[PDB]
């Protein structure tokens, strides 16, 4: 199986191995600092740790982790410009955890600057939808994403809640279904979906609980291992 | 039950709660970056995360974590000078994970510079003893620690293995007994000891398995909650 969006730096080896033995043998960990950086260079190191240490720490437990890098809105360092430079260099698998939160202009810039660069490197993005204005925010996101004419195959709206699944559907981007509740199975009415537990720092087995609830069986293989097409693997 | 030396940034909430329910309701997490920094400022943020986020993440699971800051030898950033400045400012509970590894002069300087400053702030230190030359190294450490005339109540040699417990005894510093094996109980022949599981990124319940093995009972309260005197709390 496979589980996009899952913060590794917030999981212990024990928790990790629980994934190995449950089917979740493939995950996509995204960059995220549980506190706002004082220096933009920090992110770089969080990246170094995320792509040179985490994958081993994971495979050693029996899980093939696919790292993702970027800059979460809740931790935008001052000279965020400094973090896009290092990025525009090294080759990447995908831009993880990026988006808007308080619709601040600061996010828009840090968000745009990234999704923009992403278009020049043809690398996927996992935009994140806020928990607060998960409807007033996704609009703006889906609005920013609109202008750049971002290809409907390089972005995935995540945390697509029950009362907004219509909004993102009016688009051609991929929709991420986070189980965290479990009544998302019925949301299979239609096929640009992906199951993600989003196992963070705070249980960590939802990308299979409902990933299996689908009595529709077989077909389901495109909600669990459909994130491999998006994530080119 | 208290457990000094325990890397939090490498534990999951699940793993954390296991501590809460086993007696280990008090721990001392130390700073450590699983990869060598590219910038000295990174450390600062790892500190920010370690003293403004980790303690909550822990108490939310039922454990009172006592953060410790410093610079591990296996992750000495270039301008390490930059990390001692920020340190000589904010107030601290203790200097965690510092020491020598390859006896390099670079460590000696990063190690000395710290233990030195520590003497000016009267803050405890948890020196770490290498796994390789755990005998050729601890000597130098115990040698550096000698010159500075470091008070025998502000430092604790850790990972004091069975074949070196005599070396550090010839001193007045505190000895840290890491269970990781469990045949350390017999090492109670004498009372400057502390049980530490050292639960890192890679199970995490040794500061009680042997912390209880002591049939000597009662007295034991000075091997489990004797780290409270050293950490002053
Ligand atoms: Zn998110
Ligand atoms: Zn997330
Ligand atoms: Zn150590
Ligand atoms: Zn350690």
Distance CA(B7)–CA(B1), nearest Å, equals 17
Nearest residue to A30 (alpha-carbon basis) of A54, A12, A14, A13: A54
Distance CA(A6)–CA(A213), nearest Å, equals 20
Which residue in the set A11, A201, A204 is minimally distant from B57, CB to CB?
A201
Resolution (A): 3.2
Q: Which ligand is nearest to the Cα of residue B158, counting in written order?
A: 3
Please list the residues that pair with A176 across neighbouring strands.
A194
Query: Ligand 1 center to residue B70 CA distance, Å?
Result: 31
Please list the residues that pair with A178 across neighbouring strands.
A196
**Which of B8, B33, B35 is the best residue to mutate to test the A interface, defined by the most A CB atoms within 10 Å of its own CB?**
B35
SS3 B216: coil
Q: Does the annotation flag A66 for ligand binding?
A: no
The radius of gyration computed from the CA coordinates of chain B, to the nearest angstrom, equals: 17
Q: How far is B116 from chain A (nearest CA, A)?
A: 27
Within 8 A of B44 by CB-CB distance, chain A residues are 38-39, 42
Q: Does the annotation flag A72 for ligand binding?
A: no
> Dihedral angle at the C-alpha atoms of B35, B37, B38, B42, nearest 10 degrees?
130
Distance CA(A45)–CA(A30), nearest Å, equals 14
Q: Which two tokens stand for residue B8?
A: 């939090």
Which long-range contacts does A81-85 make (Cβ < 8 Å, 24+ apart)? A81/A40, A81/A113, A82/A40, A82/A41, A83/A40, A83/A43, A83/A44, A84/A113, A84/A114, A84/A117
CATH number of the domain at A181, please: 3.20.20.140
CA atoms within 13 A on the CB side of A31: 32
Instruction: Count Cβ atoms within 10 A of the Cβ of residue A147 and give its class: 0-12 exposed, 13-18 middle, 19 or more buried.
Output: exposed
Instruction: Count Cβ atoms within 10 A of the Cβ of residue B38 and give its class: 0-12 exposed, 13-18 middle, 19 or more buried.
Output: middle
Torsions phi, psi for B3 (to 5 deg): -140, 100
The radius of gyration computed from the CA coordinates of chain A, to the nearest angstrom, equals: 17
Distance CA(A164)–CA(A162), nearest Å, equals 6
Residues of A with CB under 8 A from a CB of B: 9-16, 18, 33-35, 37-39, 41-42, 44-46, 48-49, 52-53, 57, 60, 201-204
**Which of B10, B12, B15 is the best residue to mutate to test the A interface, defined by the most A CB atoms within 10 Å of its own CB?**
B12
Taken in order B51, A49, A9, A98, the sign of the CA dihedral is positive
Close Cβ partners of A7 (under 8 Å, ≥ 6 residues apart): A29, A30, A32, A198, A199, A200, A201
Domain span at residue A176 reads 1-233
Q: How far is A41 from chain B (nearest CA, A)?
A: 7
CB atoms within 10 A of CB B173: 22
Residues of B with CB under 8 A from a CB of A: 9-16, 18, 33-35, 37-39, 41-42, 44-46, 48-49, 52-53, 57, 60, 201-204
CB contact under 8 A, B204 and A14: yes
Give the burial string for B110-137 (b: 16+ CB within 10 Å, else e). Answer: bbebbbeebbeeebbbbbbbbeeebeeb
What residue has token string 């410790």?
B68
Close Cβ partners of A206 (under 8 Å, ≥ 6 residues apart): A178, A179, A180, A182, A195, A197, A199
CB contact under 8 A, A202 and B13: yes
DSSP H helices, A101-195, are: 105-121, 136-147, 165-169
CB atoms within 10 A of CB B182: 11
Domain count, chain A: 1
Q: Does the annotation flag B189 for ligand binding?
A: no
Distance CA(B27)–CA(A152), nearest Å, equals 48
CB contact under 8 A, B49 and A33: yes
Which residue in the set B34, B38, B202 is minimally distant from A13, CB to CB?
B202
Within 8 A of B52 by CB-CB distance, chain A residues are 35
Distance CA(B191)–CA(B1), nearest Å, equals 17
* CA separation, residue B85 to residues B43, B44, B75, B117, B179 (Å): 12, 10, 17, 10, 35
Distance CA(A113)–CA(A81), nearest Å, equals 9
Residue B220 carries which DSSP code? Answer: G
């Amino acid at each position: 199986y496979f589980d996009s969006h899952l913060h590794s730096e917030g999981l212990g080896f024990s928790e990790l191995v629980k994934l190995k033995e449950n089917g979740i043998k493939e995950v996509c960990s995204l960059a995220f600092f549980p506190v706002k950086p004082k220096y933009p260079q920090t992110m770089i190191d969080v990246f170094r740790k995320l792509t040179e240490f985490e994958p081993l720490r994971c495979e050693a437990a029996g899980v093939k982790m696919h790292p993702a890098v970027g800059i979460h809105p809740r931790c935008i360092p001052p000279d965020y410009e400094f973090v896009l430079g290092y990025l525009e260099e090294g080759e990447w698998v995908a831009f993880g955890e990026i988006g808007l939160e308080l619709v601040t202009d600061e996010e828009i810039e840090v968000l745009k600057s990234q999704l923009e660069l992403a278009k020049r490197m043809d690398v996927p993005c996992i935009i994140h939808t806020p928990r607060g204005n998960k409807l007033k925010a996704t609009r703006k996101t889906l609005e920013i994403l609109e202008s750049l004419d971002f290809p409907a195959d390089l972005a995935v709206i995540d945390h697509v809640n029950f009362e907004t699944l219509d909004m993102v559907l009016e688009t051609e981007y991929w929709i991420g279904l986070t189980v965290q509740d479990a009544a998302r199975i019925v949301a299979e009415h239609g096929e640009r979906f992906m199951l993600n537990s989003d196992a963070g720092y705070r249980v960590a087995e939802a990308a299979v609980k409902i990933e299996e609830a689908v009595g529709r069986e077989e077909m389901e293989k495109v909600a669990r291992e459909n994130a491999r097409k998006f994530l080119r693997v």
